Amino acid sequence: SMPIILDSDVLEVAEYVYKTRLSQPYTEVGSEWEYNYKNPTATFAKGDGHNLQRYITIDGKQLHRPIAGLAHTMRTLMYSQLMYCSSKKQPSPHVCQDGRTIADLSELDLKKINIAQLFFVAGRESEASYGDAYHRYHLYGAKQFEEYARKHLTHLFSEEEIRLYSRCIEDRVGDSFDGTPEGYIIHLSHMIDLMRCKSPVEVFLGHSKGVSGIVPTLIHLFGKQDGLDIMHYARGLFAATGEAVPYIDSSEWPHLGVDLSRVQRALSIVGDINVPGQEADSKKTAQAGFSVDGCYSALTSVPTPSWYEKELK
Amino acid sequence: MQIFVKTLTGKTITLEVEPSDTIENVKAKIQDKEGIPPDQQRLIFAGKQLEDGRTLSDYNIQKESTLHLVLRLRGG
Amino acid sequence: MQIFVKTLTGKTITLEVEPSDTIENVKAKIQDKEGIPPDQQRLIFAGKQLEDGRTLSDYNIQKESTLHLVLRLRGG
């Protein structure tokens, strides 16, 4: 198969985002951002999580925002490239609210998409992910994209496209994930990476009644084979970047405190499935976390699925 | 009662707990037993991330239930 | 003549080249097959980095040699 390659212009924007945001410590942290549902307006916070996983130490050096850092961000751009290929093979791709599909995107669209993806969690000021923090952090990343794009990307984006792509990043309360294919692929690429930090419930069964899991969603969109190949690809990227690779064990699904019909639905779509985990690796975590060089070196080392191809012209 | 806490890679422990225990207290018990600071413990049950001020019974966590612990890097 | 290149994923490819082809030409052929732009390519043979404006002949690269492709670094 062919390799997944990111445009060199895109990698330059990645260096800017790493330097000005992803490398920076989180600021909505400390005693003023603790939370208790029993005394909820007691500090600045409106929910839990502000003080979680702010940094980890590797050989005495702190890697800030390890759950939402350079490795996470980079990985998302690999996934959109892969989902673009899968969508062009599909006899009838998912039709978004504007009437367009991922298969209607151009290579130039994918370049623009990849630039916006760089900023998707760049606005975060902690691991807080309840409604208000999520929306503020997305708003901040959208404005960081805008400010950079007006200064350096006006040869690539019109003022209209800057506001459209800022919108996709912002993800307003009133907006659906599939308003446009540009927006949908950004959301889906982000979705795939959640396997790094979510339990089997969210990944296979759906986090609440009515919600599809992450992996069932990929199967409904790309079919069972490509859906599972995307999953295994993401897991390959986790290993290359030193993430803990989760175990998969469908025999445990009925024992996780979830409604049995949520379990039957997952077994009928996914099938029985058992895959070993792998412990995190501190050296690969640092190589992927501390430079675009290191991270891109790791990501391009992973083989792509056998069906991956790109149009060269 | 006894509950299980499992990392995403499958490393398992038990805890002895009560249904009224707060999640803050549970993270203290994990810190005692495994050395992991409470601020590196992202805990999840039945698809939901757990808050510190709620209790085990608030999430309907019962004897022999399994909590998932998202640990990024042991030693980090 | 035929030479081989070990690509970034570890996969080997074949190229059809001449001893008088420049390294720049060789990167262009890799782009044509794989989609990797020349500006991301660093090519190594017998431990030495190969420089654009030189030829295969200049490095004594013969038929069925294998070149290793690695990422060209940006210092960031």
Ligand SMILES: *[C@H]1O[C@H](COP(=O)(O)OP(=O)(O)OC[C@H]2O[C@@H](n3cnc4c(N)ncnc43)[C@H](O)[C@@H]2O)[C@@H](O)[C@H]1O
């Ligand atoms: C602690 O860390 C996690 C992970 O943080 P992230 O910023 O990586 O993730 P979010 O909390 O923003 O995840 C929600 C977003 O994921 C995408 N999503 C989820 N489900 C779907 C579907 N079904 N279709 C498309 N996209 C989806 C969206 O972007 C959504 O807003 C954090 O959660 C804390 O626990």
